[PDB]
Write a protein that binds this ligand. Sequence first.
Ligand SMILES: CCc1sc2ncnc(N[C@H](Cc3ccccc3)C(=O)O)c2c1-c1cccc2[nH]ccc12
Ligand SMILES: OC[C@H]1O[C@H](O[C@H]2[C@H](O)[C@@H](O)[C@@H](O)O[C@@H]2CO)[C@H](O)[C@@H](O)[C@@H]1O
Ligand code: NA
Length: 513
Amino acid sequence: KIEEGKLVIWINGDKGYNGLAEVGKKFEKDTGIKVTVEHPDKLEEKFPQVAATGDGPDIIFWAHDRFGGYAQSGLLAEITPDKAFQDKLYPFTWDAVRYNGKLIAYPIAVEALSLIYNKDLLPNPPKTWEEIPALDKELKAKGKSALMFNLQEPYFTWPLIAADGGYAFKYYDIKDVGVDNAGAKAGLTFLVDLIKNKHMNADTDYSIAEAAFNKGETAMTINGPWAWSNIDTSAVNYGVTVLPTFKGQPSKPFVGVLSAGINAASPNKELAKEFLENYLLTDEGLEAVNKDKPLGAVALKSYEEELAKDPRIAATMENAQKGEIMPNIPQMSAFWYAVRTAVINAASGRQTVDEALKDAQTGSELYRQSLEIISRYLREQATGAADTAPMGASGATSRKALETLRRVGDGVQRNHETAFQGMLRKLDIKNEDDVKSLSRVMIHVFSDGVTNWGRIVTLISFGAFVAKHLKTINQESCIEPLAESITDVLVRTKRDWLVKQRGWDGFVEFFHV
Ligand SMILES: CCc1sc2ncnc(N[C@H](Cc3ccccc3)C(=O)O)c2c1-c1cccc2[nH]ccc12
Ligand SMILES: OC[C@H]1O[C@H](O[C@H]2[C@H](O)[C@@H](O)[C@@H](O)O[C@@H]2CO)[C@H](O)[C@@H](O)[C@@H]1O
Ligand code: NA
């Protein structure tokens, strides 16, 4: 389905795609291979959907956080640069694109948010978030505002949520999520109070914030290096500086490494490798992109030495040092989708801060919490003995959902023994290969009819029945992948229903004696 003898590239619309296309023309001139650069809307959502059917671009550019998800789904070619090419880029950029010991993309540049301020309106930018309300009152009396930034993407609010101890995953422990802790609460509350006191508007998005800054209407914005081009064109006299502190502690932006992955379904992997290594990741390649839209601190040592003398890059790396490199684990997508909803609902007043971050924590934890219950149930049902290991500090829900599942699920397997036996015989489960086939059948079953806890118990109960069969034919190693696949079907298709029911707390409540 992907065309051979051509390269199709996807990069986000905020990046230097015209610069990338010039690197495309230079590749074409030397090789006769035409490079097409596109910047589709929502390309980070659209890449996994199309790559999963063997379609999509040859090369996808995004920050590294989304790449572990793509790799886990088998959408990325492993990349195998030799040592001499590996030595040309900073090792911490290679660390960003390493997943289960394999390099799954080419690192391009380090991106961190900074405070951007209008020197003509604000010769001394504020050192603290706390002084912004008084600053705004001062600027409002002159027909100006203190601060506008994109409130529709959690990326921009994360530095404030994280300042006082909010975090995604403790360093990575997927069982330790910091989304609804007191630090996160205090940061998002400060944001909601800015909106309440009319210092910020809940509806401000990327476009509105950028135009207000670039027209001289607001003294400050929060943005990455890619934004500096449009500000150059605007004639605003701007500085790039350290983000304001919150409760005496630095803002902690999530650091992204813009990265180039190769589609596992691409029949042009050698052309893509040849383009990325010998045309893009060179002084002339990164300069062409950078001249269009600044990349940040580039992964290529030679060109990073030239760019590091720029104070805007110095300020970028200062904010980076005070932040954290984003995780690349597959959970990141669900984390971002949850926190995006929480910031928007808290900002608009649809939910209180406590409600919004509670739901975001449940969303962020949903996959791992589901897998822990389902996997323990399938394994104890198969072997006749429970797992003795502790769930941990935050798994009272896990213990109670498993106790509920045992009590309710005993009945379902006994009543459906004959139906389950027939269905198991009608399928041909014998190994890991057959377990992959099961996912289509289970999705197929879960795409028709009503959503309720009884139907979920029936799916898991079928899972336990299959796990018992697997154990009997010495295929015990297939039980964990079965559990992964049942968990996948369940959260893909029912994520929002499960968050609405308060996840597994709802399941315990619904069947409570
Ligand atoms: C992969 C098999 C699976 S997983 C699964 N998960 C949830 N629900 C299912 N079915 C119930 C309907 C139902 C009730 C009793 C007996 C039979 C069906 C529902 O849709 O609510 C199934 C099935 C399934 C589907 C059709 C025939 C089947 N016979 C054995 C299992 C099974
Ligand atoms: O808003 C959540 C979002 O944050 C990051 O996306 C950034 C991206 O890294 C930057 O390169 C720039 O394009 O702005 C984006 C924010 O709108 C994560 O990389 C992304 O996965 C996540 O969804
Ligand atoms: Na976007």
